[PDB]
Each structure stands twice: as C-alpha cells, then as structure tokens.
A and B are shown apart, each in its own frame.
Chain A
Amino acid sequence: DIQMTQSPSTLSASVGDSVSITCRASQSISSWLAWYQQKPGTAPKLLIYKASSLESGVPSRFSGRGSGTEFTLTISSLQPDDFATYYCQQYNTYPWTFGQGTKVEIKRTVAAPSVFIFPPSDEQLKSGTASVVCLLNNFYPREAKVQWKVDNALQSGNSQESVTEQDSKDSTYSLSSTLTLSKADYEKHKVYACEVTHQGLSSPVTKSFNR
C-alpha cells in the first residue's frame, strides 16, 4: 500500500501570494497523482489530474507538476475562496491512497467582531431549560475571549463555544457562545451580559440584557 505524505499540514498566506503543497510517495507513482479540494461541508472536488492536467472549471492560479516520488501543487495568487483542505491521491497501485491534507487558511487585516446577545426564548423557558447566546460575527484573527457575566458575576463553566471556518469571501471567522441554564436558576438573576476581548477591539465590549 503506497503511503502518501503531504507537507505541510497547515499553511497561511495572504490574498495574492503563492502557496506550494508537496506530496511524497512510498514507491514511484509515474505521474499517477491527482489533487482534490475539500471545502468545509463539501465533497472533494478534483482540480488536477495526470500530475499536470487541469480539470475544466479550475482557475488558472491552480497548477501542478511532479514525477516519481516528489509532486507539487501551487496556487499562484491565493484568493479568499481557495480556503480548503487539499488532498493528493495516487492511481498506480490499488488501492488508491490519499494524503493527510493541508488546510490552506488566508490572512486578513485585523477586523473587529460584531457582538450580539440573544436571550432565551419563552418556548425554551417553558421547556425547562433556557439558553443565552453570544455572537461574534466578523473577526480576524480567530483569537477572541468571550466572558459571561450574570448579575455582575463572572461565570465560567456552562459556556460552550463554536467557531466557524474562514469565510470564502472575507476570510472572517465567527464565534458563538451558548450559556445553558435551568429555568429556575435563570429566573434567580436579572442582568445577563457577554463581554468580548479581541485584537481589533481596543477595549472589551459588553452586550447586556435584563429579564
């Protein structure tokens, strides 16, 4: 079983830069290597075959070369949509083996997050468990600190954070923090606030609500 080794594992560049992803082989795959772009939530879309030939619909920035044990894939001018995981596949010996992957993430100018605090729904409150949500809509870099304050109490524990991947048009991340509280514990307090610390934010931004 030919083992394909992909290098690097994660690459970061800016809009307009070049990117090189190399694939190594256990044996000698005579130009029997193809490349696949898997975007978040989609299926691997083939971009290059026969090491060099490009499938129809693939931009000109994408190019590939290689032979034997060393193979290379190159994006000339990395644009924001090209954020995806790229795989190399052999077709010299069955079974066709893939690579480990390379997550090519783009670099964006520092952008401040937009904060929104959604209180729980009265339907959920009737269900016996309420959930307060905090939202950071468009921020780069991905690093951000979300802090829940209930009745001016810095509460840590019930929170759970989920971050989207880099947007294919703005290279902007988005974060959501979900505080889950029982209906009885939620009705004990009044002020519910979410404080955000980020690079683009010179001062932490607190969005609050009261029940």
Chain B
Amino acid sequence: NLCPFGEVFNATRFASVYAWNRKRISNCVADYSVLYNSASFSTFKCYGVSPTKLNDLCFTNVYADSFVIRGDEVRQIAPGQTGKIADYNYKLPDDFTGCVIAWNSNNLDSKVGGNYNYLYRLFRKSNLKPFERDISTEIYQAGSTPCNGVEGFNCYFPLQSYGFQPTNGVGYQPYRVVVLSFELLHAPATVCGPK
C-alpha cells in the first residue's frame, strides 16, 4: 500500500480556509520524495523535521490539511504568525512539527467574474485556537445592540468571499496549501516510509 498523498495534492476541488479538509493518512507507506523533488510548489517549509530525513522516519498518524488562500496570506500558514487567516481561519501551533507546502492555482481556482466559491472569515470575537475550524455562520456584534439575526449597525456577517479573478495580482492569485502534520502516540506505527 502507498499513502494517498496525491489524493490530497492532485485534487480537483480544494476547500476554503474556514473549512480546511483534514485527511488522515495511516496504514500505508509514504515516499515524501515525490513532494520534495517536485518544483511545482512555491512554498515548501518544514518546521521541526527535515524533509530529507522523513523517508527513514516512522509515525503513527499523518494529517493533511488542505485549503485555498491568497498569496500575500500564505505567510500566515506558519508558527507564530498573525493576521486575518492565522487569527480567524487557520492557526498552526507555535510548537509545530510538520510541513507547509503551497503552490499557485490561478489556472484552476480563478474565474472571469471571480471564484466566489472560496470564502474566508473576517470577524471573530476570539482568536482561533491551534488547529481550529470555525464553520459557523452566526452574525457578529461589535456594540451594545444585539443583532438577533441582522447585518447592519455594528452587526456583520462573519464570512466574506475571495474575489479570485485571473487578472488579479500575484498576491491575490489563489494559492493551494497543504499542511502535513505528524503524530507519535503509543500505538502501532502505521505511516512508515520506504525504509
């Protein structure tokens, strides 16, 4: 058995940031070479582990979290970074021992009018805990007037849409990001590399 990394990477439709997709890779053999030998990715940063020293390493569970962001926000997919995405959409723990792999997807995730299918959260009362997913649609409130289900004065819909048009700059061009997290618990080690 070979770990279905291509199922996560070479996928037709990716998920939005407020609803990143976590796939549990387990009970297979994983050749990470196919990832660190491919130049298709613009951001390949591995924190805590060396990409080369993984095909000889063994783990119990790997987690591939996929989501589509904009370029000038990919930097927030890293430990100890803060903005809109890291604070309200996807936060990686400061003690992160994993990998972040991001490439450009303007040719697949951008429409003439705009790929409004991708969303991102703009408002949240609390900053997101590490590895949190807020799929809520409840209205925000920034005053003393309870909204009770209305978008207006100090009351806003939490989610906004990405205006992904092909002519947009490289900073606003859609980038697909996959975060590979690694786990060791006291259980049968399932994800073992070629060795």
Contact = CB atoms under 8 A, between A and B. Distances in A.
Interface string A178-194: 00000000000000000
Interface in B32-85: 72-73, 75
Interface string A59-71: 0100000000000
A55 interface: yes
Chain A interface category by residue count: under 10
A162 interface: no
Nearest to B170: A60
Contacts of A60: 169
A14 to B, nearest CB: 26
Contacts of B72: 56-57
Interface in A37-63: 55-57, 60
B53 to A, nearest CB: 21
Contacts of B169: 60
B33 to A, nearest CB: 23
Contacts of B75: 55-56
A60 B73 CA distance: 16
A120 to B, nearest CB: 49
Contacts of B73: 56
Identify the interface centre among B72, B73, B169: most chain A CB within 10 Å of its CB: B72
Nearest to A57: B72
A101 to B, nearest CB: 27
Interface string B106-145: 0000000000000000000000000000000000000000
Nearest to B42: A53
A45 to B, nearest CB: 14
A62 to B, nearest CB: 13
Nearest to B81: A56
Nearest to B83: A56
A151 B30 CA distance: 90
Nearest to A58: B72
Contacts of A55: 75
Interface in A130-173: none
Contacts of A56: 72-73, 75
A56 B73 CA distance: 8
Interface string B156-173: 000000000000010000
A60 to B, nearest CB: 8
B144 to A, nearest CB: 34
A60 B75 CA distance: 17
A77 to B, nearest CB: 16
Interface of B: 72-73, 75, 169
Interface of A: 55-57, 60
6 contacts: A55-B75, A56-B72, A56-B73, A56-B75, A57-B72, A60-B169
The 6 closest A-B pairs by CB, nearest first: A56-B75, A56-B72, A55-B75, A56-B73, A57-B72, A60-B169
